[PDB]
Chain A
Amino acid sequence: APTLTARLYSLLFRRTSTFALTIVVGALFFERAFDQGADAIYEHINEGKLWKHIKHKYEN
């Protein structure tokens, strides 16, 4: 009853509509956080290299 999976179930999972709402709201914030991360990993593993890092050489 202190436990967090319990309160997750009680507030959000018990009803299928709330379950669906928590998935769609969940999917919005996942798409941001994953694309933020996975781009930043890909960009860091290719340190210069891409036209995003070349950009500043040719002017405004």
Chain B
Amino acid sequence: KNLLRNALVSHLDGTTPVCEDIGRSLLTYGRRIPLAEWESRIAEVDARVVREVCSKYFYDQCPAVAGFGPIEQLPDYNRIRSGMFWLRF
């Protein structure tokens, strides 16, 4: 949470990143979402939310995988798929 407040605020620092954010946000959200709203959205996140929201996207889902270079030891896809759940849980 703290890392994200620090990233958000440290990013919106200069005319250029703020101008980008005005421009981009009006294309994507249709508003500017003010800094105090993000903080409200960040503050709501606790451990239960992280467990819920990560499970939703990560747990037992098929990854897309891209490999370039000396990749003989890159695990087989079945074994990457198997890394997406836990037998203990």
What is A's interface to B at a CB cutoff of 8 Å?
A: 14-17
Contact = CB atoms under 8 A, between A and B. Distances in A.
Nearest to A18: B89
A16 B59 contact: no
Main secondary structure of the interface of B (DSSP, over half): loop
A16 B83 CA distance: 13
Nearest to A15: B89
Contacts of B59: 14
9 contacts: A14-B59, A14-B60, A15-B89, A16-B85, A16-B86, A16-B87, A16-B88, A16-B89, A17-B89
B85 to A, nearest CB: 7
A57 B41 CA distance: 82
A38 B60 CA distance: 37
Nearest to B88: A16
Interface string B27-61: 00000000000000000000000000000000110
